[PDB]
């Protein structure tokens, strides 16, 4: 066997692994300098109680002799496909267009592998680092970075006459924490149809959206069904620890250049390469959809975000995002801390670990990403250090 | 987007779907002719009780605030990797060589996609139909069918000076129900090393092996670590309904032509494209490994198989396999029932649905596959019809 060449292009980093070992390093050499890590995370948040109950009840069902498979589909439990259609998508998407998977990282990889090698793929800049790697691994001819800058309300800057096959969009965005609004999405969809671009719309942070005016799905947007696919899943920090579940939406209307429907090939691809999500995870998901309006956890984290924003602004920082996603995209203004300086700057001046914007790509230059997903104690501490 | 060409090569069938609709059809037009379906299946068999208990206990743990991620790896729960190493592989495989996934269909697809397009892949003939499809979908240059015939004790007939990159092996085999013994595997491994072939060894039926002399893993075979990967998982019919779990074994020693280690690239590939198996499924797996020696279910099905074999032989049928797998590979002898005749022949003469051998490939000609995975009532009925 020869080595895979699609493979040799990789180096990734890993951005967060390296930042983590560096935080550990700093902790070694600064034992009395207590560090509030906002560069990532908080796990520890437990599986929601009613979700867990449903999961166990499904297990109890599986162990009794009836029973019952249930091999799915394949495409998912009808009850989950239907509940996603109705409650999650507010009727914008039909049950038959929803394909249940075990999560949004696998799905992106399945989708990019489904579309094949030699595609040119555009991604927002700053970029979700996972995307570039999957793009390279699935054999992209080129990756085109699309500057999203606050001066443009984060609308991606499309390159003049450059061929794009796939546009990956993450909204709410990692790292900017911003959301493309209805007007912005309408223009992007119009742009995509005009240039024969397929949109992969990653909406995994959509539960974080906090004004009901904003779109939650790209299928709220005129003409999206002729050029877009959505991927989504439950947010672990919101209480889905242990639930391996996601979904992909393929509109009935979406076609290849020759008029073949994407959905028919996707169905065949999935059947050939995939066994379905587990029955208990799916039944847990049905119960998850029910408590999604409730969720005290979302409120807890929006509080974290508001707490952070105020401190940051009061210290003369410029703050973007954080309203509709668990990230704040933060610009000093300035003391001209260079890109290679930023991480040490925040550690040394505030004992706060962040992720420097530049690790996310060139348009991250000058910025830092704050994670809102942490204990209230750590957030409050962080606000003290900034208030000094 | 243009259509995927790797895709347009597909037609598969589906062999079992078509056979099923035909059994339903026959049931329509023959209401008083009761049909014993041995062409597939029996699901309904419930999740093992101690496995279910472990699963629920993991859920209870996830819902309590500690807690605790647990993102894995990535490569799997240390307790499961270690228990597979020690109990499942009897020490033949180290924990660090075992990569936990959500199942053996996904893993085959991951592996073939990991090795890349344009490979030439050899598969046993008669073939596990799923393999050909994944091979085509991942971009194989050619698929080479390897006749496995009873005259040769089912040893695959390798083609004279023909370039092979990957050899897929399924042992115990679907559809022949036979097992390649230590001597046969030793020769295949020697052949593979000499021709620079990588073996993908699918051992998903290995729990069915009933003499402790036979190898259960290819890593019992001299020199296998220089040319082989194993894939495996729990058998659903044995009591793992609802458990989305498999594993891949990459030996530390395995290298590409240039001397790079496969295991290092596999680790990177998996991290980039995969989030891990669910924690509850893995903890359930640990408990599954414990009861694997016990398993009344294996005994139940071996009984089914012995029952079938006797009836078949007493009716002058030639029977192969069935000792170490839940399939019997059966030859009339003859009444010269053509290949297109066989399914109707068994339905009409015995009210037994089987899968004709020819659906599995050219070397299936003249044979029929019996499934041993059914209720004792249906097996006994089937034996009556054959005893006439």
From Swiss-Prot, chains A, B:
Q: What is the lineage of its organism?
A: Bacteria, Pseudomonadati, Chlamydiota, Chlamydiia, Chlamydiales
Q: Which HAMAP family match?
A: DapL_aminotrans_1
Q: What does this protein do?
A: Involved in the synthesis of meso-diaminopimelate (m-DAP or DL-DAP), required for both lysine and peptidoglycan biosynthesis. Catalyzes the direct conversion of tetrahydrodipicolinate to LL-diaminopimelate. Is also able to use meso-diaminopimelate, cystathionine, lysine or ornithine as substrates.
Q: What is its EC number?
A: 2.6.1.83
Q: What is this protein called?
A: LL-diaminopimelate aminotransferase
Question: What PROSITE patterns does the database record attribute to this sequence?
Answer: AA_TRANSFER_CLASS_1
Gene, per the UniProt record: dapL
Q: How does it assemble?
A: Homodimer.
List ligand-binding residues for substrate. Answer: 14, 41, 105, 128, 174, 275, 369
User: Keywords assigned by UniProt?
Assistant: Aminotransferase, Pyridoxal phosphate, Transferase
């Amino acid at each position: 066997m020869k080595r895979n060449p699609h493979f040799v292009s990789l180096t990734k980093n890993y951005l967060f692994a390296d930042l983590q070992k560096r935080v550990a390093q700093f902790r070694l050499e600064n034992p009395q300098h207590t560090v509030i890590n906002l560069s990532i995370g908080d796990t520890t948040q437990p599986l929601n109680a009613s979700v867990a109950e449903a999961f166990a009840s499904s297990i109890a069902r599986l162990s009794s002799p009836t029973t019952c498979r249930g091999y799915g589909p394949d495409f998912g439990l009808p009850a989950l496909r239907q509940k996603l259609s109705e409650d999650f998508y507010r009727g914008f998407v039909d049950a038959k267009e929803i394909f249940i998977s075990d999560g949004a990282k696998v799905d992106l990889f399945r989708l990019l592998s489904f579309f094949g090698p030699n595609q040119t793929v555009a991604i927002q800049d700053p970029s979700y680092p996972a995307y570039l790697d999957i793009a390279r691994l699935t054999g992209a001819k080129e990756i085109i970075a699309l500057p999203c800058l606050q001066e443009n309300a984060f609308f991606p800057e499309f390159p003049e006459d450059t061929h794009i096959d796939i546009l990956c969009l993450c909204s709410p965005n990692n790292p900017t924490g911003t959301v493309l609004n209805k007007d912005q999405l309408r223009a992007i969809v119009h742009y995509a149809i005009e240039h024969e671009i397929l949109i992969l719309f990653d909406a995994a942070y959509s539960t974080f959206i906090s004004d009901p005016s904003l779109p939650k799905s790209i299928f709220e947007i005129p003409d999206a069904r002729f050029c877009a696919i959505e991927i989504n899943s439950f947010s672990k920090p919101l209480g889905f620890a242990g639930i391996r579940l996601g979904w992909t939406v393929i509109p009935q209307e979406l076609t290849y250049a020759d008029g073949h429907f994407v959905i028919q090939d996707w169905e065949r691809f999935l059947s050939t390469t995939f066994n379905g999500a587990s029955i208990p995870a799916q039944e847990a998901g049905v119960a998850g959809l029910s408590i999604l309006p409730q969720l005290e956890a979302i409120h807890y984290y929006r509080e974290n975000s508001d707490l952070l924003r105020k401190a940051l602004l009061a210290t003369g920082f410029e703050v973007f995002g954080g309203e509709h996603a668990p990230y704040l995209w933060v610009k000093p203004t300035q003391a001209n801390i260079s890109d290679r300086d930023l991480f040490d700057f925040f550690l040394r001046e505030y004992h706060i670990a962040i992720t420097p914007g530049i690790g996310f790509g060139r348009s991250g230059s000058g910025f830092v990403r704050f994670s809102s997903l942490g204990k209230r104690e750590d957030i409050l501490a962080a606000c003290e250090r900034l208030q000094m």
